[model samples]
Target: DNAIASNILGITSKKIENFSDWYTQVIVKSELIEYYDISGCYILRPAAYYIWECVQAFFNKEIKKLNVENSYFPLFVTKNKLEKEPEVAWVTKYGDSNLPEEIAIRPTSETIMYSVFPKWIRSYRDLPLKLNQWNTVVRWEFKQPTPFIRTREFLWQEGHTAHKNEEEAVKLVFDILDLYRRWYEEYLAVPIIKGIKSEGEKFGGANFTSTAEAFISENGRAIQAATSHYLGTNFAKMFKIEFEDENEVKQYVHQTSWGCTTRSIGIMIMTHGDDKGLVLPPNVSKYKVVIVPIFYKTTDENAIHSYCKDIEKILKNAQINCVYDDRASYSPGYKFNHWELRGIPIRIEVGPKDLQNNSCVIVRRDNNEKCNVKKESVLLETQQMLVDIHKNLFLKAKKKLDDSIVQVTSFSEVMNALNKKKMVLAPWCEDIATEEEIKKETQRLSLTLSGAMKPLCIPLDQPPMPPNMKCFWSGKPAKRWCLFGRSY
Candidate 1:
């Protein structure tokens, strides 16, 4: 029994000692994902999919409120229409027969969806066509593929909108960027920085890009959580998406495209997971609580189980997400470790003594603090406990992020701070050439998990820069302060 338990339930890799191995173990051992035959793909099991469904529910409702309509586009585009901005995954063979022309799988939906925008919008009334699709895209990237972070194929919501002018289109970009921030902080309990991607790092062909950046302090790296981009008539000109104004002049429509992907799950795992296993926040955990009945050789097993069933029913009735583990085959000790590895926010233990007293012991996953609550008030207590769990997880991660950033004025100081696993907030010339030079210099001198340090973002919230401040590396007059880090 001990051997089997160790083989299945144990997380052997210490999180800090071996961060990558620990991450792979926690996700696999928790039964959130399974390795696939393909090189860059993994099966997202129910435990992981449930969290995605929760994301869908929250984001779908919010975007619908902003008049974004849900729609779908074809997965493959003809060779002539394929946009080659990102390497395209082409479908060249049907069964054993070779195709006449290679059809390109979507790297993104822009080319496929924008091809028909001219037909859909000919008048000013047709402006501001906002559509979003929940789908998967294939980008045959050559980079080392991490399961959820850099997979060749993944699920995401890509939102595309067309507006009359740049102002209206840019407004939606920031609006959607705020929604992305909320999704990271409120739903996933991961704190983020809202900022603009630097010119060298912005999306291909985008006029400007807004981003939500998250940090994994343990790895001393930042991850791009999500992005919203304003495409200023570039794609519209390519696809000839035009509309006639009230003044009878035909003009190209300005556009925006934004996306949040399965990568967010990877970011959450890196942020909150610990040495034991996955540490889920209550808001996104599928089973917020697991109820286990403790049986003794002389105790009334039937009574204890029936009591647990009653509690499960009550929680379900109150719309709390929960599960009752009534498997008699496993011992209470084993069940405790099982749910702990699964990252359920709370665990309720009903035993012989508690049965007699009409109470149960509640254990928190975050800190392993246990409390006895009377059965009569269990409903209210459980709800409040879940709320507190979310707050605790967020606050802990928020503090780590806050403590990881350091303000620097010199290039050498930037290197010193980064070597200490701290992010640098420094004044920059905002020059693309300077950004590239910084990347090259950091890649040469840095000893970190990922090599080169780059501008994570120019934070929307700026610190007061004095009139004579100069760029940390180039010594040009500083334009704005930017967050720089080694990123995944």
Candidate 2:
């Protein structure tokens, strides 16, 4: 019964055989995202929005501890200010009328916020103005759009800061990088590789950008999970954001911008979702458990239903997020598939026999392991099981990441490694031109649909370099080992 229902409403594409199709089906069928009529846009359903809300809660708490204050900025920007950023979406029409002047939708708030910084900043006393906004931005994308990865309009938290000194600003950049690292690993249960973005890949106006990169084994593509950029005084100079120093000298403020977006939700799905459906980590799933009461024609239906509600109360009292599924329209088998597809961490089944025995069957979503626990011990057991599920998901993802890294010493080896769907860690000259040539060469020789190979990052954890090691492609003296791969 479950299998038949799955065939109709669940994902039909196997993740390993057809990743793109599988991803499309999983998000829609799981009721996370719905495709929009407009290209490069999507509608986040309740299930998806709940996960984003959870992410916001965790990130808001952490950033507040660092003295980052939340604020709102307008979505509309002056065309003059946005001429320097990503391709802007324009507002040319009013209600059944044309506007006199064209206004641009912000792709990022750098221009909008920095323009106003000079008004608020007067002296060094207002040095560190850390402001962050939870909002949506628009970038008219030309490339093919994937739901969360390359959407034109998406929700994100963009943080902008101004500081008195370069050292203080630089330190905050790395600190924020660590916060992003924690958000990906500890909260999302997705393992990540932290490093500095290559010069060619760093943010356009930033001095340098640091990133948290995550890989999807299903397609062997690296996703830039989160990034923190040290914008230095470039924007400060452009916007005349200066402060009167202690010695009464005017100095430009050092600035930094960082962001994490809905793409994170896509990365999480790609990392842990299986052929069955989304394997959500207990930490972020709003409904961690679903109690489906089973009934029989000659059995005590009221008693079974009452027992399921009792278990829900017990779990709720212990602060567990759960739901009791007593809907009569759906069979128990159909309900099981429904909850599983939605990625509940645990599913509890209460039948007449189990009700009589004062026990219920518990099944884990991470693995289909089942156990019968006495009703009295449901709270302790469910709490412990949620913890175990999160742990298992992280370790499983970590193992795949560890297994996918392949180190190489030459250009041929680099190409071979990438062709075999592995991330290449090779000695690099760290020159922008060399990285460009590498991208062109790999894109030309690529066999898979995944596009060009580029530098993912120069990992902070450096390996011992031999005295005269040569660059993998340039044959020049090696500067560092860089992770290179095809990226989403």
Candidate 3:
């Protein structure tokens, strides 16, 4: 009975009903990742690593066009280099012994990478030295690790660049920020809010940070999918990264660093994945289509195999990512479930009977609906299915995001909105002290202030609330409303 129930359990419906349990089940059962003996660490299996490869291919093309070269940096940062900047934070008491002066385990690559910028950049010609690295970073967090969402060690690409001027550096930061936004929105099909991080939430030593945040998770919390930081000259000043200009005057190079991580895979899981398992976008799905050969005992197996071969060739010629499930030992029904669990965008079912009728059944993964198409049109139909799947997932996520945001104007309203598991957009006298107090009151479940919204809310005439809502947090006379929510 349990086996039958498990067979009947749909990934989309099951995960939605019991999110926490379903997440663990789908991640582990789908063979994406597995836990290791090391706490807060995971072994990314091929299924998940393939997705990372897709991400790498997409980002590599964008950054390489801008002259950003990939390189590797040391994983461990010595105490001397890490403590040189007091703003840098390090996790204490790792491994077997207490660290001497608390060496930082590369929570980010800023200090270490910039330490080398001075060596490579000696003139204005080399001012814009763009380099990127694909590596893992360690951030010591005591909170329970949630796979890709909140792991202690995770894989990511950190792009660090040195520019000749603040204008160029800021431009690079926003350019990459937009690229990240597009990666999530266009490729991942997850809608997000793009904004600058508030001072209190800014990266430890950066001048300012901009982020693309997605808010369509099961619990309605905002997850920072990626961040791009404009470091001004702080890193160059500290590391002595100077370039000699045409006039022979030495100047500190302005810099920027930005990255996206494996956490994106986790976001994909939570965002499009349903109770069935992981619902992957066609752009990121490892295999876009899977062909299942169906044949009855009375049917000619040779004929079915030959027809499936022809269909596979047609799909390949169309340049669609596909696989022919022609294992003799596996039944059609079993192969169907396997591909469904894997979230292949489209499944083509061709059996001896269908071949006789010159037709095949195309089943879409997003919805288990099937369409019958003539064999001659299989290639064209496969292409259409890919487009339809992307459109369907994007519309579904857009609808969820539209329904999840609630507008509020008071602190009590903010609390109530969050309690109802919705992201709140509210006007407030934004004050650092009040925000800090709210963080304490809410047990660290605090709102991320994503810049200001256009068209200001009606000016409040009532006596200002605590910390004074002169402006949202900045105390600049509340000029605009902003979206605020507890974040991951």
Candidate 4:
């Protein structure tokens, strides 16, 4: 029974040609989450929650360094109050439709938090009040449920800050955005484009929105990894978040809001996972190394444990997140399968033979590459190896992202680009009407042709629009360029 169960427990979906199935299977086989009775909600199992905590811990520390303190806001908002927040739809009916004032659950904290901003700041000393909250929010998502990628409820950290002037507010926007880019590209081994949103693409109430774009290379789609919005006194004027300045004049405070959600977990999984299962980046992986000791007899068991403990201590001294897996009921092969499927970044196999000569095989989960290392050189070499693994995954995804951006000059060319499932870089007049024309067509394409597409962002890292360039569809003078694509 154990043998059959263990073998069947491994993933069977082939990622190359069957991406959706592979994603669902990997999430389940890895035990990252489980389905609840509700359609668009799922239980975040321990493994998944640990990833979120790692994200939370790193972000919490960094935000504090930026002088952004942790704070909380209520979960519900008035109907008119929350109608502006995209995901803040009211859930089930409120008893015979009484819903006094038509209050709705928060989609994000902007609506609720801004209301209290007026009470908190009274003078120039309180000019910059930065606050963040880690919480779950609900939105009515009327689409196919896909765990972290698409859900009615998910965990995130939303930051709200009020600044005295526009320059400070804009600076806060990109500063928080840099943290997000680093979290994805550095720690999560995902490459992202840090950019600004279009007029129509910016958050509904935001003056301007800065964003990070991540491409899911395996599935031929892009995901918005995070965003920062410069609110520009819009919310302050509405909520009366004003203060007396050094001149003793009452002035409205400029504000900024930013957030990164659980969808990031899904992005990480999609970016590096495979037919075997998840391939975690070493930096954020909870257990950087799993120590699996092997033995053939009862006599060797104690010795194996002793060796593992000694080695784990050495690695621990180096601050490696190491785990000693000594489950007797499972075979060494079973242990390897378990850790690999769980996407643990590194694994040390300490079997009876390796111990005879004082050595063990270190396996990298990212590529399934194995190497023999002398016990004495393990610490220094393991650190370098893990660094190389992270670089390898990051560069691999970077190459894919670079290769997939098909630069084009015509509308007909974009159709072919979409047909080939490529991310597109194209010239545009960037007019609101010009953008809307493509968006409406994209909506038709996804409906008539079975896919979704849109103008994702006006990349901040963009080159100057040439004087002679023309728009792809309008044939008018080009204003700028944008990265357009199908997205999740």
Q: 83-114 in candidate 1: lDDT tens per residue?
A: 43348888899999999988998878887988
- Candidate 2: tens digits of C-alpha lDDT, residues 1-488: 66565545677889999999999988998899988789999999998998899889999999999899999989998777776444779999889898877898988888789889999999999979999999999999778899987899999999999999999999999999999988888878988888999999998899999999988877788889999999999998888899999999999999999999998899999888988888798888888899998888645987888888899899888788799988887888888888888899999999888988999999999889999999988888998998999889999999999888998898887777776678989999999998889888888887525568899999998888997999989999999999999887
Candidate 2: regions farther than 4 A off: 1-9, 84-86, 447-450
TM-score of each: 0.96, 0.96, 0.87, 0.93
Ranking by lDDT: 1, 2, 4, 3
Residues 1-488 of candidate 3 have per-residue lDDT tens digits of: 55434545645446656777888878887889898998888999998898888878989998887889999998878887876673334656767778666666788877788887788999998768999999998877766788887888889999999898999889989889878877777777777667766656768778988887777457656777888899998888788999998889999999899989998888888888875677778888778889898778655788888898898888778777689988877677777777787778898998766888999999998988898999999988888888888888888888887677776555556566676667766555545455565556554444423322221112112223444445433435553455667665
What is the lDDT for 52 in model 2?
93
> For residues 2-101, could you state the per-residue lDDT of candidate 4 as single tens digits?
7747654687878878888899989988989998998899999988888888878889889999999997788878777766535556655665765457
- Predicted structure 1, TM vs. truth: 0.96
Provide the lDDT at 480 for model 3.
43
For residue 199, model 4's alpha carbon misses the true position, in angstroms, by: 1.5
TM-score of 2: 0.96
User: Which TM-score value belongs to model 4?
Assistant: 0.93
Model 1, residue 292: C-alpha shift (Å): 1.2
Better-scoring candidate (lDDT), 1 or 2: 1
**TM-score-best of 2 and 3:** 2
